[PDB]
Amino acid sequence: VNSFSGYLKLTDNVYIKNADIVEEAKKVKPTVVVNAANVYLKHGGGVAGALNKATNNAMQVESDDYIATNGPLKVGGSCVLSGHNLAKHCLHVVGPNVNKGEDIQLLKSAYENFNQHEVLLAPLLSAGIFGADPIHSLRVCVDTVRTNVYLAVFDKNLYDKLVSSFL
């Protein structure tokens, strides 16, 4: 039993809610919140800018030190950093940017990172400025993640369509 509330059950391990991941993180303080990051951990907009703004830029400060030491992530890769005031940890996961020509097949690799964590609060990867079809992203998630994932979708009309489609 966990403290995630009001999520619609999609599969055995995937639950979904029309909500802001920031507000869900502040309320639940999960062990792991997933960030939809880029390889440089530059958290400007989307989920990344939203999470970072909620940390008063501490996420960005920590991220800049991470990159200075380790260099950029791989597309499809991830790193574990602090969750600051939002969660214990933040798993920064890089989905492919299909508006940049990056390989959509890398979306499955990106979701594989979730399997290293028993429970996660996450957004759909590669949506938004990265341009992937949300229904596709949701389907890859269901077919790849085996741990317990709670999805927060912050677009009402998109959420409504996602919960009326097949997976």
Ligand X SMILES: Cc1c[nH]c2ncnc(NC[C@]3(O)CC[C@H](C)CC3)c12
| Binding stretches for ligand X (CB under 6 A) | 20-22, 46-47, 50, 123-124, 127-128, 134, 152-155, 158
Nearer to ligand X, 83 or 134 (CB): 134
CA count, 13 A, side-chain hemisphere, 152: 23
> What does DSSP say about strands 32-36 and 78-82: parallel, antiparallel, or unpaired?
unpaired
Query: Minimal CA–CA distance to 6: which of 164, 161, 153, 157?
Result: 153
Nearer to ligand X, 96 or 134 (CB): 134
Nearer to ligand X, 25 or 75 (CB): 25
Q: At its nearest, how many Å lie between ligand X and the CB of residue 47?
A: 5
Q: At its nearest, how many Å lie between ligand X and the CB of residue 24?
A: 8
- What is the rounded radius of gyration, in angstroms, for the C-alpha atoms of the chain? 15
- Any long-range contacts for 112-118 (C-beta under 8 Å, 24+ apart)? 112/144, 113/77, 113/78, 114/34, 114/141, 114/144, 114/145, 114/147, 114/149, 115/144, 115/145, 115/146, 115/147, 117/31, 117/32, 117/91, 117/147, 118/31, 118/147, 118/148
Distance CA 111, CA 125 (A): 8
Nearer to ligand X, 1 or 130 (CB): 130
Q: At its nearest, how many Å lie between ligand X and the CB of residue 96?
A: 15
Nearer to ligand X, 114 or 154 (CB): 154
Q: At its nearest, how many Å lie between ligand X and the CB of residue 19?
A: 7
Q: At its nearest, how many Å lie between ligand X and the CB of residue 124?
A: 5
